[PDB]
Each structure stands twice: as C-alpha cells, then as structure tokens.
Design a protein around this ligand. Sequence first.
Ligand SMILES: CC(=O)N[C@H]1[C@@H](OP(=O)(O)OP(=O)(O)OC[C@H]2O[C@@H](n3ccc(=O)[nH]c3=O)[C@H](O)[C@@H]2O)O[C@H](CO)[C@@H](O)[C@@H]1O
Ligand SMILES: CC(=O)N[C@H]1[C@@H](OP(=O)(O)OP(=O)(O)OC[C@H]2O[C@@H](n3ccc(=O)[nH]c3=O)[C@H](O)[C@@H]2O)O[C@H](CO)[C@@H](O)[C@@H]1O
Ligand SMILES: CC(=O)N[C@H]1[C@@H](OP(=O)(O)OP(=O)(O)OC[C@H]2O[C@@H](n3ccc(=O)[nH]c3=O)[C@H](O)[C@@H]2O)O[C@H](CO)[C@@H](O)[C@@H]1O
Lengths: 450, 450, 450
Amino acid sequence: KALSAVILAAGKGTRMYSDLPKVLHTIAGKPMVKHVIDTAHQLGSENIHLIYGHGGDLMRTHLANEQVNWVLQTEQLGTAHAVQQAAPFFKDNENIVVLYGDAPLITKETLEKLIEAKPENGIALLTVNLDNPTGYGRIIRENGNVVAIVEQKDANAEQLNIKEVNTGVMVSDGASFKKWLARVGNNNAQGEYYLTDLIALANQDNCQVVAVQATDVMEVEGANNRLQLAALERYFQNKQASKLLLEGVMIYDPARFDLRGTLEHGKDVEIDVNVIIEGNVKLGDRVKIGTGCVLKNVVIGNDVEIKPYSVLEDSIVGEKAAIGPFSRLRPGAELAAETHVGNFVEIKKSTVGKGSKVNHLTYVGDSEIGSNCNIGAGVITCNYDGANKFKTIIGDDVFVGSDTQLVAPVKVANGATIGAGTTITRDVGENELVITRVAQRHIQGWQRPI
Amino acid sequence: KALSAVILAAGKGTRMYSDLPKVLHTIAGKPMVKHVIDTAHQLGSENIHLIYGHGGDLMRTHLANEQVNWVLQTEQLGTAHAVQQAAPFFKDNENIVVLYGDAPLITKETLEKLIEAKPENGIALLTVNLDNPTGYGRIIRENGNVVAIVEQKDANAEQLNIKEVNTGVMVSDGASFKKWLARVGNNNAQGEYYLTDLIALANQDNCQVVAVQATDVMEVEGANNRLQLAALERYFQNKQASKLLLEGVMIYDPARFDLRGTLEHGKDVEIDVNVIIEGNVKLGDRVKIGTGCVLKNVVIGNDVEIKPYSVLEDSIVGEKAAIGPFSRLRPGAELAAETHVGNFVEIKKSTVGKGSKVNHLTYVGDSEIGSNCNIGAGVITCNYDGANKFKTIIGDDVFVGSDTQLVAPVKVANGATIGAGTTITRDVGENELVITRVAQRHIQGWQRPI
Amino acid sequence: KALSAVILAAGKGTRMYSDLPKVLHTIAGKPMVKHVIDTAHQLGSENIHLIYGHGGDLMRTHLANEQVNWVLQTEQLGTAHAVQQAAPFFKDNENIVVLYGDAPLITKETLEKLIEAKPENGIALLTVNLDNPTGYGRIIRENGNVVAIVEQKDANAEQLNIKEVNTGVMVSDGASFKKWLARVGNNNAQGEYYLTDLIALANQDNCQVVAVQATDVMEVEGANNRLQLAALERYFQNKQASKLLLEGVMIYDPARFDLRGTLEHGKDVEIDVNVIIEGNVKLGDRVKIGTGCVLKNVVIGNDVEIKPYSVLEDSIVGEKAAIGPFSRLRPGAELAAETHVGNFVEIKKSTVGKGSKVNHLTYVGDSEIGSNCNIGAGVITCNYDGANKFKTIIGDDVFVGSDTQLVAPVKVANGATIGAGTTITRDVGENELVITRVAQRHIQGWQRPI
Ligand SMILES: CC(=O)N[C@H]1[C@@H](OP(=O)(O)OP(=O)(O)OC[C@H]2O[C@@H](n3ccc(=O)[nH]c3=O)[C@H](O)[C@@H]2O)O[C@H](CO)[C@@H](O)[C@@H]1O
Ligand SMILES: CC(=O)N[C@H]1[C@@H](OP(=O)(O)OP(=O)(O)OC[C@H]2O[C@@H](n3ccc(=O)[nH]c3=O)[C@H](O)[C@@H]2O)O[C@H](CO)[C@@H](O)[C@@H]1O
Ligand SMILES: CC(=O)N[C@H]1[C@@H](OP(=O)(O)OP(=O)(O)OC[C@H]2O[C@@H](n3ccc(=O)[nH]c3=O)[C@H](O)[C@@H]2O)O[C@H](CO)[C@@H](O)[C@@H]1O
C-alpha cells in the first residue's frame, strides 16, 4: 500500500511565550516541524499534508522550500477537524499516518513498525506508559484489546489512574479516515472534534485497533513549553553524538557537544569539549578541534589542528593547516595547505596561499595572499573613506613587517619586503624593499616619577 | 501567630579545608547563609537571630548589610546551646523556626507547611528518608508517633538501620523553647547539649510532636564539604534554569547555564550553551546570547545579538546593537542603539553613539564617541606618561583611520576624517582631514633568501 | 607471595575505526594501557609482561619509557595463547594477575582484594552482574561454587540468561598457570585458545575457584569502541573531580572540569566551569581560575586570578599576578609577582618583572622586561627579515608608548620613556625619552558624504 502523511502544526504554543508559532521553535538548529516533514519523506510518503494556522505568514516564510501540501486550518476546532482539512486529498487505498509538528523525534523505524501493525480496514496507534500520565488521552482496554481513548478532561477517577496513554500518532487507510471523521462530533468537555474518537468509532464498526507500545519515551514526546523542548534537544544531541562515536569520531564528552546540521568526517577525528558544529561541515582525516570552537559551514582538510576558541564560518582550510587559538575566519576565508593563522587574527573574504603565516593581532579582508608569505603582527588591510571596499593583492614570498597598514586598492609583487610600521598606498614591485624613514627626538636626562 | 527565625552558623567547616567559616562558601555567587536569611525574611520572620562564632570577623564583613540579630556563640557546645543564645529574645507567643546556614536550599513553601503542621504547645520537625542515613539523627517512632531523636554516635545497632532522619529543622513556640532548653543536659557520647533532645522532652510533657516528611531530598541537604556544596550548586542552577525555561527563555542546555544573581528578561530571548549571568542583568525582547558569554551587571536592549566569547561588565547596550565575538566591555561602557563592536575590541568607561562601529583590534577607554562614527581597526586611545588619565572626545560622523593613536586629552569635532597610521595629539576641527605624510626608502633588486 | 602482571594489549580495535591500535586511545590524555601499567606498578608487580601485536611500532614509540617486558604475540590466537607468551617468565611461587590494556579503570584496591581472595593452588577471578550480559563469558555456578566460564558464542539458551559475567581479570600462581595453559585447546566456536578454560581445568584438578564480585561496574568495563571510551572518560573525570573537591578545591561544576595529568593545589582554590588542566600543574593558595581557561604545564603562585578564556602553557606566574581575560601565555613565559597581563595579549619565551603591566593588544616574544614597566596597548616585538630571532631587553621602570614596534636585537635601559607610535631600532639609554616626530597634512573644509 502507498502512504501519505498529515502533520498537525496549527497551534499557537501559548506556553512557549513567543511571537513564533509552536512548531517553528528549533531542535538542533531547525524547526521541530522540519524534523517531522523529513521523517515523513524518508518513510516514503507520497503526499505530506501540513495543517497550519497560527503564525501562518511565519510558517510560509520559514518553510517556503518544504515539499508539502499547505492546508490552512482557519479555526482550531480539534484534532479531527484538523485532519479533515486534508481528508479530501486522501486516496481510498493508501495508508495515512498522522503526525505532529511539536513531536519532532519520532523515527522512521518506529513508524514503519506502526504501519506494519495496522490491520486491514482498522487502525494502528502508538501508545506509551508514563509514571505521570496527566494531560494525555488514556488507553481503554477491554479483555486486552483497545476499544477507546478517553481524554484527561473527560475521564472519571478510575480512568485517570491508567498509565498507558495516546501519543496522538495513528495510521489508517484513506477511505476509513473519511468514513469515521464524518461521524466525529464535539459533545465532550472541551467542545472539540477529537481525532481520538476514531478508536471507539472503529470498534463500533467491528474493525480492529492495534496499539504499538513505544519503548523509548522521549522519542514520542511533544514540546508544549521550552523546558520540554530543552529535554528534547539534549536527547537528540546525545543520540547524534553517540552515532558519531560509534562511527569512530573521538568526542571527548558527548554531553558537551552540539551538532546543528550535518557532519561528514574522516578517520581519527578528535573533538574536544564544548564544540558547536553548524550547517554543513566536512572534516578530513586526523582533524583535531580544540575546546570552545564554533565551525559553521566549513571544509577542513586532512591533518588540520584547530586550537581552542576559534570561530570559523563559510571557510575552507587546506591540509596540514594550523588555526588558533583565538582565530576568527569570516565568510570567504580560504586557507591553502600548510598555512598558519594565530591568535587574535581575523580573516574575511580572502585567500591565503600555501605555507603562508598570519600569526598575531591582524586583520586581513578582501585580500589575495600568495604562497610562503610572512604577514607580521599588527598588520591591517584597510580602505580610504570612500564608497565600496577594494582589494589588496600580495604575491608569493612576501614579507610584510609588523604594524604595516595595507591601503587598498594595492598590489605587492612576488618577493617584496616591507619594513615594520609602514603605510603602503602605492603598488610595490617584484623584489622591492620598502622601509619607513622615521624622525625621532631624543631627550636625555628625562626622569620619570620616582 | 507571629514568627521569628534562628539560624545556626557558628561552625568552622573543617572539611571544607578553608580559611573561611563554613557558611560563607557560596551557592550561585552568594554565601549559603545569605540564601537562608532571605528565605527566613520571605517567610515573614519578625526577627532573624544569627548564631555566629568561628570566622566572626569574616562573617561580619561579608554579611554587614543583613537584617539580622548578631548572636555570638563563644563556644560551640551543641545545637541546643546555640539556640539558647537567642532564647532570651523569643516572644512567648511567637513561633520560632530553627534553620542552618549550611543548608541553603530550604524553601519558603516547605517551611510554611512545617509551621502549619505544628500542634499547639508542641513541635513540628522536618524529616527525610535516606538510603544511607549514616551521620544523621534517627527518628524514633512508637505506634506511628515520633517520641525521640537518637544521634548516630548514641544509637544502638537496630536504631542505625532506621532510614528516617532529622533534617535539624523544627518549629515550636517561644515559651516552649525556653522551657525545654533549660532541661537539656549533655550526658551523651559527644558531651554536647543536643537540640534533638527537645523531641523526647516534649513527649515527656505529653506535648505533640509532628514530623513533616520532605519529598525533595536535596532541598534539605546540608553541605559539610565542597563535594556536597557542588551537588547543591548543580541542583540550584537546574532549578533556576527550569524556571526561566517555563517563563519562555530559550536556554539551549540548562545543564550548561549559570545564573549568579538576578535575570530580568523579555520574550524570545535565546541563550546558547556555557553562558554565565552574574549580578543584576536585564535582557530585552529577542536578545540572543552566543556560546561562552559572561554578562555581569548589564542592561541589554531589545534585538541585541551578543556573539560568542564576549565578556561584558557594568555596561549598557542599546537596541539592535551587535557585539562580539571576542568583544570585551569593561565597566562604564555605554553603547547606543545600532552600534557594532567586533572581535578583539576592548571598551572601557566610554560612550559610543548611535550607529557607530568599532569592529576590530581596538582599545577605546575614557572616551566619548558620537553617532555614525567609523573607528578603524587597530585604533588605540592612550595617554602621556603623566598622572591621571584624560578623555578623548570624538564628535558625530567621524572617520578614524586604521592604526591611529588618539593621545588624550584630545577632541575631534563632527565630520572630521583621520588617515590611517596617524598620531593625533592636537584637537581636530569640524570637517578637518588629517593625513600622515610618510617618508619611505625604496630599494630595488632586494632578493630575499631562496 | 611475590606478584607479577600480564597485560593483554595486542588487539587491533577494529570498532574504534582508527589507525591506532586499540590500547593507545587515551583516557585523561594518556593511553588506556598506561593507566593499567601504572596500576600494576602500584600493586607492587615485580615484572609487567606487556603482550603486544597490532600496531607494534606505534606501541613501542608511544610506550617507549614504560618499565615493562615487551612480549610480541605475532598471531592473536586467543587469550590463553597471549598469556602463554609470557608464561616462561612466570616464577612458580609468585602470583600472576591478568589485566587488559583496554580496561583502564581497574583500581589497586580491587586487585588487592582479588589477590587476597585467591586460595592456595587455585584461582581468584573478578566477576560482575550486568542487566545486559551479551558478549561476555557467563559464570557457571554449581551449588554456589564457580566451576566454569562459558563464552557467548559457545553458550546454550539457558546459559545466555546468566547475568553474572567474567571481567577477564584473574590471579593464580605461576606454576598453576604453566600447568593449565598447556592443557588449553581450541575446540570451540571461535577456534581460539580461551584463557577462560582455566576455570574448568582448575575444577578438574580439584583446585578452588573463588569469584570476587566487583561492586562498581564501570571500574571493570573495557572499551571496544569510542562510545564506551567516552563513558570511561566521564567516569574517570568525575572520580578525579570528586577527589579534588574532598581535598578542598572549589570546582563549580565537576561535570564541566577536565584533568589530563596531575594537579597540585593549595587551599581556597576556585575553578570555574569549563576549565582544562593538562600536564603537570601547580596552583598556590587562593588561586582563582575563570571560565574557559586551559592550563598546560604551569606553575601559578598564591593569590593569582586568571580571568576567563585564558590559555597558558609551559609558563610560570608569580604571586598576586592578574592574567586575562583572553590572555595567551606560550612556552617560556615567566611572569613575576604582581604583574598584569590583559586581553588579546600574547607572551612567548619572555620574562616580565615584578609589577609590570602588559594590558592590551600586544605581542611580546623573546624578551626580558624588568620591574614596574608599562607596556602600552598595541606594542609588538619583531625582527628583521633575517635568519634566527633575536632578543628585546627592557630594563626597570620603562614606559613603552602605545603602538610602538621594538625591533630586535635592541636594549632599552632603566627609566626610559618611549612615545606612542615609535619604531625602536637603536638602543635606548638610561632616562632617555624618545618621541616620534610626525609630519601631517591638514585639509580644511573636507566634507564626508551626507
Ligand atoms: C483530542 C486529542 O487528539 N488528544 C490527544 C492530544 O492531546 P492534546 O491536549 O495535546 O491535544 P491538542 O488539542 O493540544 O492537539 C495536539 C496537537 O495538534 C495540534 N492541533 C490541535 C487542534 C487543532 O484544531 N489543530 C491542530 O493543529 C495542536 O496544536 C497540538 O500540537 O495529544 C496527546 C499526545 O500528546 C494525546 O494524549 C491525546 O489523546
Ligand atoms: C545534635 C543535633 O542537632 N544533631 C542534628 C545535626 O547533626 P550534626 O552532627 O550535623 O550536628 P552539628 O553539631 O554539625 O550541628 C549542625 C549545625 O549547627 C551548627 N552548630 C552546631 C553546634 C553549635 O554549638 N553551634 C552551631 O552553630 C554546626 O556548625 C552545623 O552547621 O544535623 C542533622 C541534620 O543534618 C541531624 O540529623 C542531627 O539530628
Ligand atoms: C575467551 C575470553 O578470554 N573471553 C573473555 C573476553 O571476551 P572477549 O570476546 O572480549 O575476548 P577478546 O578475544 O576480545 O580478548 C579480550 C582482550 O584480550 C586481547 N587479546 C585477545 C586475544 C589475543 O590472542 N591477544 C590479546 O591481546 C583482546 O585484544 C582484548 O583486548 O573478555 C571478557 C571481559 O570483557 C569476558 O567476559 C570473556 O570471558
């Protein structure tokens, strides 16, 4: 049988105390709902019907690229009413899985088990045993079989003691959904059309209802507030770190590691405590990342060491380079093999050729630097007070003395040597040595305070 | 009935291996005893009798501003002897709660329940069940009712198996305290006057003793050493972080967050991992704090982003400003709206006007900078080798070229432009352009080593 | 009885996905096998027979200084075959303890208990109860006594339910080892000579086998992959931090503290969250280390405060010094008492005398600086484009103005004063004042863009 998905995502999320709608709060740097859409896609869903409502404009801007059917629920009249908005698109002979944009950790594997357990013309639902089931629909079983779900606000004293609860997740065929949704009313304590009434309706039709008990409680947990969200984040980060460790990445402390995107890695990679990996990051063999580093959208070659407290974004680093500590690579930084970038150095939109060193207290922006250059401490690339920002071009085997200002646009040809304290405004030729002539006054017998 | 409190705080705390007395070790940046004094005050205590002894001078300097009755216990002859030092101040018809300066996490709510449970002319005490009750007074019950407490060193083999123990915390009326304290002896294994003998004395008077069992074990835990203290710290920080999360603050990892003071916050505030908030901090709406930041006594306006590894103290930042990464704001830094402070920049006792940028490798101290200024990389405010430290005043719409030294006292008027590499000692006028004239030697055919 | 040890360490460690052999992966900065060798030595082992094989060259380079008997196992034919390689060196009347280089946390105390429990002419082994014993040899008991070990791959369905398993660790006398090893075959599901067959062989000889049940499960755990290794690392770091806390070191959060070497400490030392201590570190009384610091091979005197995000290596800091935040001390940095090193300052192979300050945006390398000097912001020591790197010598009571370049080799004598923006190439005499003469152009009525 084919499969499509419906994702309920219309909620305001009042207890997040936010201007965002509930499902756009992030886990590992992306909206909760994006995790759910991705899972529905990996499961092989032909269509993904996204039920949205509150924060509609924000949903559409933040999820503009998602391959979903946008189904606007103008009023939040209950979970059955939400699913019914998508029901006209259900094929009679496909399975439909109901998912929630605020329950982001549900796995493909669990959902495949749920789908496989669904009986013909019946329903499969995911349930879970909780020590404290307050708030959740209670699973009612007669002679071992599920016959109904009773919500917290509708339950009598005995039913509230039931520890097995509804996760909300269920699967049935499209025809059965249409049939039963039309028979859902709103005669209950909340005045809502409950999706949960489908269980008792199916029982009334002598159709079978199978519960699959989820064994990992956090996997099926939803987030109603940011405390719950943080619990999901920690669970997810632990899971990601455990996968990387089993793949052979040495993460010194998995509880102090964060991945917010994707990590491609070689062998014998070592990542010290308190590292954050964001966006798409690729690390070669034997890359070592020191404590406190932030890498966002970077490619790091084999045998690179990044020393502590380095922040790198949208940058490429060649093999055997050495970066840090306290180095800053801003977007467009491209460091060739065997380069050295040191403490309190900022590189922005610049290329730095093989073997070159930029080891202290330096800003290099909008520059091209060749191979085997020595960029002294305190060197700064700058511009005139003009309009746009021009380029500094330095050739191969150039020595730039400490505290030199390179005033763009300017070119320094191969083999040139620039003395310390120089202001370079004119192009420097091949093998040209430029030294600043200083005038000083010397006053003898000057006594400082005793 | 009225209420007063007695806080036992005279202990040396030998197992802390410290020159401080036991109760001055901090939790969340303040002495344990300060947490207890604050709780006693919130409970509505009319008087707070602080029993002190060891490290007396240090107690008085560190707690100089606390609204307490200073009761010096010259010799530590037992918990009953300690309370008896305060007993002459007890009103006959007020309740007295006994608390300990080394048990800082006891809450107002728990103590209100304890006070409410006290029977007329009797005692209420807080007890707790422990898996390992070694060291603690055992609660002796006959026919369900508490009749005595037996200390570890006085207990027989059977009594040592009792898992219910005394937290030390009790409430009785002032008259009953005076009565029973006078009948406490020191015929026991420690030779001490035990406050715990009040339970058996009350039973001897046919007065009722009610135990309230505390359900949160850490809440009533004391710290005898720094390992126990660290456990209390973690518990307290988790509790603070959980409260903030429920209030709508996105704390990415509550286990890597520290608050050591007070935090006022707007909505949609995001705090990344490893942030420390100290003193009194106020954050506006949509403030984002990156990893590794330290904020101590700061006010941050709406929509400010603080990028990673920024350290800020005694500073004010206006709306829509951007700070970091690797920025340092020292006391007296005042940044207006829409300002930009970048990497390896230190600002001390300076005002920076709206729209101004200070983006790299710069020190600005004792300065006033106007609106829409461009403070170049490598700029430094400095002084003559003199006595005190004078001011640099920069107007609006000033461009300060890279690597310029501004030698205070000096003024640069509106619209002025200063070239790179300049040493400014004289005042610069409105719309004055100042460019350094350099002399250079150019030597052709200079071959660097091949 | 005497004692020697055999450490099995020949494994490839395939599931580490590494170019290193299994036992060279580190815990707390040293190879797992080094922890085991050290424990065997503290136990009083006369000989330590190291069985090695895979990654042999790497073993010999990384463990070159270890006092062990190098026993090469050319083929890994089973745990009995490994021990048999060392068996010719066993003395008949010494005890032999079998240990594993991939199980690094086993303590001297546990092994002393195991050795004491060994019956004459019999065997003592360490066992442990696991909820999931999959993979491990099951302990077979008849009438309470251990009679055999059955490996996972050889066990029937009933035996797989046994929760008591073999840790691998055992002790017997040298003569008994020789006797039983000669009778071990390889008729089993793996085709290997199992060391575990010694238990059933001993039972066949009517010799006694005693199991000592380990109560700390992590202590006896081995690491087959990096996930398991990370679990061992966290356990070990917690244990180290707990010891330091009980000794009186205030570690604000023991879960965010790492020691990778040895720490000697005074009293009232305070270490904030996310500090890493590497190599041999000594801290005096009342040393305070702020968040994010990395200290590797340093000596810190009494009353020093290291402010956040400081990185120090191979350096000495005198009493009452103040370092950080964002300070970098590279090897050979020696700071005298009452010195001050500030933000974005790098000191390398330099001495700095009593009372001197280097507070911002400065590089000092290969320098000697005297007492009570004032090294201004932006100061840099540099060299000519030459061969080797020469020294800058600054006397006592020298003022070096901001943004000055000191071009080595150069000497500045006591009491000298150097103006801001100066390039110093010639020696400066005692009480000599050196001021740069600048030429500037002033252009009035220069309007910047409106
Ligand atoms: C009636 C119902 O289904 N109850 C289930 C629901 O309770 P619960 O009380 O959580 O039901 P809610 O009404 O919050 O709806 C669940 C989710 O669907 C979304 N939403 C809801 C209504 C709507 O008209 N539009 C829509 O987009 C909500 O924003 C929320 O994200 O969640 C649990 C799983 O946690 C179960 O234990 C309950 O059995
Ligand atoms: C006799 C007594 O009360 N025992 C209680 C006490 O045992 P414990 O053995 O902890 O009693 P201690 O003698 O340490 O006194 C408790 C506290 O009161 C302070 N102090 C004590 C004596 C003194 O003369 N001056 C004073 O300021 C101590 O420094 C300490 O902070 O603590 C426990 C709660 O943890 C209980 O289980 C015990 O029933
Ligand atoms: C037959 C045997 O002893 N089984 C024990 C072994 O199983 P396990 O299946 O772990 O046995 P392995 O064969 O992995 O050997 C254990 C260790 O000895 C080393 N090695 C092994 C063989 C060899 O010829 N050379 C050598 O250096 C391995 O690399 C490994 O580090 O470990 C467990 C403890 O975790 C026990 O529960 C098992 O009862």
